[PDB]
Amino acid sequence: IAKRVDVAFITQRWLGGTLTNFKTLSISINKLNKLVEKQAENAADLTKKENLMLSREIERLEKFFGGVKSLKRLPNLLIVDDPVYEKNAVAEANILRIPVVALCNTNTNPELVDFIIPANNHQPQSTCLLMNLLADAVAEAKAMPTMFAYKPDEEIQIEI
Amino acid sequence: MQYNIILLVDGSLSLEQANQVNEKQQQTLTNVEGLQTEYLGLKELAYPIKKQLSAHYYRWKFSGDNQSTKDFKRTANINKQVLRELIINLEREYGYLASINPKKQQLALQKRAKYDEIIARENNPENPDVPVTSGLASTQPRLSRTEKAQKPKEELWDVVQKMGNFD
Amino acid sequence: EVKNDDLELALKKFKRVSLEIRRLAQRHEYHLRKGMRLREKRKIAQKKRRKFR
Amino acid sequence: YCRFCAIGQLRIDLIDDLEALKRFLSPYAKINPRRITGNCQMHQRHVAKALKRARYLALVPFVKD
Amino acid sequence: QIDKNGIIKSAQLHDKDVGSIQVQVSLLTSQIKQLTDHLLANKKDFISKRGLYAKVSKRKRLLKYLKHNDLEAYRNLVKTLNL
Amino acid sequence: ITTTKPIKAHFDPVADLLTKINNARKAKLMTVTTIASKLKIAILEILVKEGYLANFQVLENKSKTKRIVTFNLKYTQRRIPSINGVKQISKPGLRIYRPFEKLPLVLNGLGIAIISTSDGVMTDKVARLKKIGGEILAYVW
RNA sequence: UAUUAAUCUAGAGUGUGGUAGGGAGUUUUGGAAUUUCAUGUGGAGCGGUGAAAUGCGUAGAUAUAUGAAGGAACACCAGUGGCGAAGGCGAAAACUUAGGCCAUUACUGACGCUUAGGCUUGAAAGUGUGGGGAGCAAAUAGGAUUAGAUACCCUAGUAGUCCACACCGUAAACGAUAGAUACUAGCUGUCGGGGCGAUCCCCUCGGUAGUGAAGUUAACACAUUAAGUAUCUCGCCUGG
């Protein structure tokens, strides 16, 4: 979904502090730009240790700050697969004023989510269908094609 | 109450004299009637009570006066012919009136189905099946009706939400 | 065990028997409070339950 | 799995039930624990009382196996 | 035994009554007498003394309540002497 | 209409209704029931005509042998009860009776207190209009 | 609200049937073990400690085989067990008795809570009267230990530990939480009652535990058995 639609994404969950302030996000994006445009000219000149450190820093930035490189203002929306296992960001959003839309079956606190989606994520097919539906929902805004919104077919795929 | 009086003769002795002493000692009972004469044959004791490893056991079955036994108690203890005078009454934990007994079909089905007569059948003695079909100790219903109602309202949805078009 | 027909396994189980005898006599080689005795009994039961899940 | 739970008899007499009691007898002639017998709270103490009464009647040796 | 049935037959007030005042007080008196006999038999039955005191308290409070709310309520006392 | 699990009268009308109200607004419960009596009927009447309470019903099975009342609470889509606080002033151990000019007012007039003088319970403003004082029973707001 | 007059029964007990326990006391019975003694063999050690010693031994001990006497505690079952108001309650049985739980379709008519004063019970140590007194053992003696040890270690030995009668009324007599009254999200074990039924699971009322949201307390922590919610009564609290 992230490689399909030009929107930011999170690979590994937040460690806290990466969403409450913009200055850390600003130094992160500056580090990303400096790292990429400097490693564009440094791949085998010195010892393998520094080049491997550059690659490791790139991979770490992908792990944590991978998707946050196209924003100048704080994210106006975020979609969560479950309030459990992602409590930090949703708690910050309660502290903040940003609206929250999230998936939750029954293991949530409905107070922490302002747009409840009682869609169970235990079965992979339902999660895939809802994720594609939301991708198509955000697709129309940027004038890009939609695939599964009114299609008379259910996404069936054996668990990998 | 019931009276299961288990009586012991003096070790290994004859049968004729055993019946003689049994019927002689049964004369001490004051007025209680309804007993059955019984004998449990020649059994082997687990440990030597006095000197013998074998004796005759006797089981009594009757019901009557609660004060018609202490005399038998004081006569049995002193004499050497009678050794043990175990008494069971209806104080032993029990209960049945007309419907708690006929449930032996449970063990009948256990014995029948549990044993395997075919090499392709296995029915474990601890298995669940969810057999509760009808009968549920009904919830004690109690009906009523309103006579003076006022201000009817209906609310369907109550959870946190907010407006749209976040600008 | 009581009988003996194996090679040395009879003594191997007699080791368990002797351990049981020693642990039973553990309550009869020194005197303590009855309340403390029952508390120790409860603690031993808890230890057994931990050994037995 | 308890035999006194598979019947629901809730009552045991001294005679004609001694074989089960002796089956519940350890080779040390002691009352077996609740790990295997399956008796929960009532069958267990009834069996214990019956075995004690049998011991008083010299049906089960006390310690002399 | 107390033989409650004779106590029922003693002072009935209805065609079927086992919870009236008269039956309660008569059963209380019978139990009091039985427990007095048993306590003079053995003089260390403390729980029995506590039960005796509970029974006598119940009897006294019921008799006082009957005498307060009704006048002819204690007409079973002449035929069944108090205490 | 059916309610099993029989209820019991707590000790008295005012304390029972007030503790039920407090526990309901703590637990966000819609419907609360209690034993029927004239005083509780009057309290429910005044508290529902004062715009602090939802539907209220009084019911019986066949006689006064089992007669109860039940009531709901006014709410909002944002999960907030209309009432916010309550405190009983009259207690079974102490009842205070006050004249006209000693009539208390809650918040500063925002809250409503319940005063009964000779014609059932009523609001403070009406009692002051009729210049009859009497006894208060509880403050709600 | 205070009085009286009546009514009805959601309180209360009563009864009916089912019902569970180490509940309590009185009276009989058993075995296991210890000590001593008598008899059978026995010949230089025994016993005890971190090390040793005190102590015991040729009058032949410990080791054992059989038996007797005798009184103290009633392993195994025995456990997030149960019972009672509390202290407390666990060999077997006989007698009496206590209260509890469930359906009430039964009864009477609010007879209910608490309780100043009084009354009853109330570990263990001790006091008085008298027995019995196997072991266990404060004070007491000895031997080791220590600079010293009036202690921990060991061997000795009464009070006492047992019981019958009449006393003491102390405590960490603790859930350090007075009782009662209703009401307030859930979840997981155990047991008791009812129904269904091979067990098992199911539901309903309960005892009993653990986990855990609102809420509360300064915090710890508590959590339908509250230290929540409010009420009634009694007692208690005013720096050290």
Q: How many domains does chain E have?
A: 1
The resolution in angstroms reads 4.7
Residues whose CB is less than 8 angstroms from the CB of residue D61 and which lie 6 or more positions away in sequence, other chains included: B46, B47, D29, D55
B113 closest CA partner among B146, B75, B105: B105
Quote the CA–CA distance of B165 and F68 in Å, as a whole number.
Answer: 48
B69 closest CA partner among B165, B4, B9: B4
F123 closest CA partner among F102, F84, F132: F132
Question: Any idea which residue has 């004729």 for tokens?
Answer: B16
Residues whose CB is less than 8 angstroms from the CB of residue E18 and which lie 6 or more positions away in sequence, other chains included: E8
Query: Which chains share 3+ C-beta pairs under 8 angstroms with E?
Result: none
Strands (E), B37-129: 42-44, 54-59, 62-63, 85-88
| Residues B96/D11, Cβ–Cβ less than 8 Å | yes
| H helices present in chain A, as ranges | 22-39, 48-63, 87-95, 124-139
Q: Within an 8 Å CB–CB cutoff, is residue B148 touching chain F?
A: yes
Lookup: tokens for C34: 């009855």
E49 CB closer than 7 A to any strand G atom: yes
Quote the CA–CA distance of A8 and A30 in Å, as a whole number.
Answer: 16
With vertex at residue F60, the alpha carbon angle to CA F54 and CA F63, rounded to the nearest 5 degrees, is 155
B127 CB closer than 7 A to any strand G atom: yes
Amino acid sitting at position F45: E
Sign for the pseudo-dihedral over CA of C24, C25, C29, C31: positive
Give CA separation, B108 vs B105, D6, D43, in Å: 5, 10, 19
B41 closest CA partner among B23, B58, B26: B58
**Strand G nucleotides within 7 Å of a protein CB:** 1, 8-26, 28-33, 75-81, 84-86, 90-99, 103-104, 106-112, 120-122, 136, 165-166, 181-185, 190-205, 214-215, 228-233
Q: Do B141 and F77 touch (CB under 8 A)?
A: no
Q: What range defines the domain where residue E41 resides? A: 1-83
| Residues B59/D12, Cβ–Cβ less than 8 Å | no
Helix axes of B16-25 and B70-78: crossing angle, nearest 10 degrees: 140
Quote the CA–CA distance of C36 and E77 in Å, as a whole number.
Answer: 56
Give CA separation, A56 vs A60, A70, F30, in Å: 6, 22, 58
Give CA separation, A130 vs A102, A146, B24, B93, F141, in Å: 11, 14, 94, 63, 45
Quote the CA–CA distance of E19 and E7 in Å, as a whole number.
Answer: 12
Note whether B touches F: 3 CB pairs or more under 8 A. Answer: yes
* Chain B interface disruption, residue of F55, F66, F82, most B CBs within 10 A: F55
Q: Give me the phi and psi of F136, to 5 degrees please.
A: -90, 160
Quote the CA–CA distance of F76 and B157 in Å, as a whole number.
Answer: 9
Quote the CA–CA distance of A116 and A104 in Å, as a whole number.
Answer: 7
| Residues A152/A22, Cβ–Cβ less than 8 Å | no
Q: How many domains does chain D have?
A: 1
Contacts 24+ apart (CB under 8 A), B141-144: B141/F2, B141/F4, B142/F2, B142/F3, B142/F4, B142/F6, B142/F61, B142/F66, B143/F1, B143/F2, B143/F61, B144/F1, B144/F2, B144/F3, B144/F59, B144/F60, B144/F61, B144/F66, B144/F68
Quote the CA–CA distance of F31 and F40 in Å, as a whole number.
Answer: 16
We find that the CATH architecture of domain B4-88 is 2-Layer Sandwich (3.30)
Rg (CA), chain D: 11
